Symmetry: D2
């Protein structure tokens, strides 16, 4: 039968007999994502351009406000880390719950003007310390995630939710404002045919990345070369990696020596989705999910996707170390 | 002062003292684009998955454009990426314009929710002969109007005509295309290059060297960034709004490239030239190619003029 | 073949060879009505209740209609139930039409969610002098177009002009008005009567007797049914669609009626007459009343012609 | 703090420490209501009129039938119901054993039939009981008096879409925001006015009125104490008329006459849910002889008379009615 996000989570949440708090958190997040989607699709833009006479908020800020407010009022969270905010937000005591959430409310906003995909990325942790809530509660390794995923505001809006039972994909039906389950227990292809990275950094690449990409374009075994795709929005590039397989790279380069993407709310959520889908995600040195963060906005290199492709890259990496 | 597409084009048409047929055409096209956008955003998908107890999206998109244009009384010949032969409008509905379109561009990848789009070019029928595919075999220089709809994070219609390029954002709350950027011009030189570098082994030597200069600039300037969505509408629109260069050039598998002249290259080349950019095959302007087959391919390199001219310098060096 | 409000008006306008101003006006009204419908259905209400951490609807609806009509370049004088004096369009946006409208008919009503609507009447400015409130003082016989949008279970625009009455359903998936009922004609005689019987104490004897004939018919037919929503657009639209009669008569506690002649009675009378119905004050056709004040009231009895004639027979008895 | 139907119900239930089955039921009901609302507002009607050339024709079902299919399918798949009674089908629907939950639902999927083509308000009425018999579930489990209701209410598809939900604590109203498909709490713990100024019934039937009804309506048009006469409103859709009665006060009547000596409306999925909403809002609902909620049904489709609304107005009707006994 048909299933919706709310019903799917409600029913899985009744089964494993948890405190109900994660279900409440996810439902509040879903509401925020639907509201972001509506704003990203520009519903009501006519009023901004004077339809009612001579006359609000950048999408970035509004998306952050929507996630912040819905998570606060879920009574399920205590610490919230957002790409938008310099410091972690500590939820007021009367609305504090069990969970810590790191999120990027509108990934890809530097591509909004060209209208390409934007998205929301989130990662959810159980607060581990009994201390008063603080930034330190978000400094957990991605291995500690209890749920993670993203919403892609693409040609359609889809929510990908990873939990320790696997990855499930929901399509927003805007006629009824309902996320419909359309792909259950998804697994990434063992090996793909697409590679995805910004090759404009070629001058600054490590020898390992340089060699690996040369193998994709000029296969030593004379097989067909991989195709290339790079949207430049991480949700779009990672989602395509999930559904068609292949490999996504945002390595450190000489000008971003610790990486470009942010560990807490870009790399770790996507690494968790990948691993729950049977894929891999590495910094080169170690699994993304094993990095122990020290700073909430710290960066990380990331190479992720189909296991055979990531293993091949790691083989090239070991040769150059 | 707020402007919808409907109001804008009609007011422009009055000042041009036309009959109104082209305005009627564009209105019918916009209605089709709104319907494509709604289906692309998956309105009603809950019913397909059983909420109450499977045509392809680009077939439906083709049917929408075909039906809306036929019933506009403004068209006589319709060439679609979707259809083997040109469609001849029934005599009682024939108007004076010929439309070439790709109803859902980039749609072999809707599975990843990548941007998709609709591309269109509109010609005046040039002879009084009985309508046929020959009426669609005009060089892009002959275009009366061209553009695209981009179904991305939001839905946008870019409309190019003799006057220039104007961009309209679809407000889905009221189904109006609102004018948001007027008389758009591309920047003289950009900092993004866009092509499928997985073809690298088969590149023409000039393409190899040009792309090498983007990554390793001989003057030690900043390397260009790379973007390649693999959807023509998305890649061209980014080129328009940010500047830079987009390439689908000729080589081995493809002495004529791979994109199609009538409903991919020509509409995009026309938008580009009206916005102050360029679009070349490497040997000529795209808009100067006289087609002989409605599905014929053309190489295309387009975008900011300084970038396209720099590509042509490397191209001549290898010629 | 499918048709839309925009395409229907535009093809009808190009045919008639008028100045195009009426087409521009109706398109601007279309846009305003879709924006009102969106707001009436409470799109975005979550933001009012703090989802991210200010006008009432009647005011917003007035602003939408006023702004969109002004920017149509088709109007010169605008009369709204919301504004004490007529609005004079500034010289650089002036066209030749006068519009009287009720931007959101239904007031003691929004809070209980029953149907509301927008009513409009479009008169042509005869004179050649500077426009003023006096130009809106014209009989309904000078209407060139009139109708209403009903925001009910669905949103419908009913448009009457000299060719007759046509009904368009708003498809909110694509934000387009779809032609669904062409050349509408009201039933010759209906079976429903519609008025507020709470005024029975103050009813004129002719109204009292007519209503008794509906409840106890002199020929032993079945009694009429009664329906009274209390929103004029809803009651009149039901009258048009199912037949019957609608009454807001002069009671002794207000001898000129309650409803306003210019932007409630006249537009509805015009729709009715163009659909083969009738609309009377009791003494004369609503459309023949010559107003002396833009907000003057008039009694109205309208609907199926045999039903209005039967009321008039009773009315002439009490003389 | 903003509140949605889902979150509001979720946390009221945790306070009551229920199983969560009722919350699950209500969530699935809300999904059906959103789908009904989208169809009633005519989303996609352009495809019915040939926008894509008439190759694309659900969609073609009448709204009545679609609405029943939507409610039936979402309640079945909720895993919260065992017996479902709809106006549409002669017999009660018994949920497949695999999907069986503990609740019984009686509903009117799209109240207002002679009424869609003129675009008047339509709506969805529902009443929710707990199964009590230990037997295999059967039609008999729906034959409970309105007093046993766990929850009831309606969706009104009017100028906007509103869900009114009554439970033993009281009545709450949620506005559907169609931009995001969320029911927003806009009016909490709603109470009806003690006495109103509007009366609601089909006066075209006057020839067939009970003399008690005739007298009462005469009293509202020509008050004996020389007070202002009441205003009259009759939409002809029960959900619209009852919602107006709830919001503005007054009285709504569908009493016994000639075409129907037992009234016209159906007890299980029209009269009882509105009677439960009214009583939870401080109002009344009588057949004339007894409370609607105290009628013990023997037939899932039996009719009942109903007079409901502001308590002072209903009491006054009852005094006239007793005087004609
Ligand atoms: O990998 C997968 C798939 N794991 C399952 C996903 C998951 C697990 C645990 C939770 S949980 O921690 O939040 N636990 C509750 O939800 N427990 C509860 C127990 C009893 C009733 C209710 C309830 C009541 C009313 C409405 C909704 C639910 C909730 C949430 C999600
Ligand atoms: C920037 C630019 O190139 N603008 C011109 C775009 C354009 C649009 C449409 C046409 S058209 O051939 O379709 N003609 C019209 O739209 N004509 C028109 C519109 C509105 C009103 C009237 C009119 C004129 C005179 C009397 C009554 C009505 C005509 C051409 C160019
Ligand atoms: C059934 C009925 O009553 N039909 C008459 C409807 C009608 C609509 C509009 C007009 S008009 O006075 O506004 N005149 C025009 O619209 N004239 C016109 C001439 C040429 C071109 C155009 C046009 C319209 C739309 C887009 C482009 C060009 C309009 C009169 C009667
Ligand atoms: C006004 C009024 O009467 N409110 C009560 C409404 C109500 C709604 C739903 C139910 S229920 O039977 O379905 N039970 C729940 O919803 N229970 C519930 C919700 C959320 C979380 C938890 C929970 C409790 C303990 C541990 C984990 C999770 C339970 C009852 C009354």
């Amino acid at each position: 039968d048909v299933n919706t996000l709310t019903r799917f989570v409600m029913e899985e949440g009744r089964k494993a007999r948890g405190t109900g708090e994660l279900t409440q958190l996810l439902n509040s997040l879903c509401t925020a994502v639907k509201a972001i989607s509506s704003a990203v699709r520009k519903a009501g833009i006519a009023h901004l351009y004077g339809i009612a006479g001579s006359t609000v908020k950048k999408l970035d800020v509004l998306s952050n406000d929507l996630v912040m407010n819905m998570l606060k009022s879920s009574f399920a969270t205590c610490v919230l880390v957002s790409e938008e905010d310099k410091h972690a937000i500590i939820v007021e005591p009367e609305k504090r719950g069990k969970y810590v959430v790191c999120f990027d409310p509108l990934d890809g906003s530097s591509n909004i003007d060209c209208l390409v995909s934007v998205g929301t990325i989130f990662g959810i942790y159980r607060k581990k310390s009994t201390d008063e809530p603080s930034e330190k509660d978000a400094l957990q390794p991605g291995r500690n995630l209890v749920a993670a995923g993203y919403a892609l505001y693409g040609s359609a809006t889809m929510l990908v939710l990873a939990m320790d039972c696997g990855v499930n994909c929901f399509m927003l039906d805007p006629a009824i404002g309902e996320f419909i389950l359309v792909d259950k227990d998804v697994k990434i292809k063992k090996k793909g045919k697409i590679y995805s990275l910004n090759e404009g950094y070629a001058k600054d690449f490590d020898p390992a990345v340089t060699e690996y990409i040369q193998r994709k374009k000029f296969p030593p075994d004379n097989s067909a070369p991989y195709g290339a795709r790079y949207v430049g929005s991480m949700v779009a590039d990672v989602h395509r990696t999930l559904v068609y397989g292949g490999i996504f790279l945002y390595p450190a380069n000489k000008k971003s020596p610790n990486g470009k993407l942010r560990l807490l709310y870009e790399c770790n959520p996507m690494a968790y989705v990948m691993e729950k889908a049977g894929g891999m995600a590495t910094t080169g040195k170690e699994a993304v999910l094993d990095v122990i963060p020290t700073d909430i906005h710290q960066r990380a290199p990331v190479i992720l996707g189909s296991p055979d492709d990531v293993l091949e890259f790691l083989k090239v990496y070991e040769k150059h170390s």
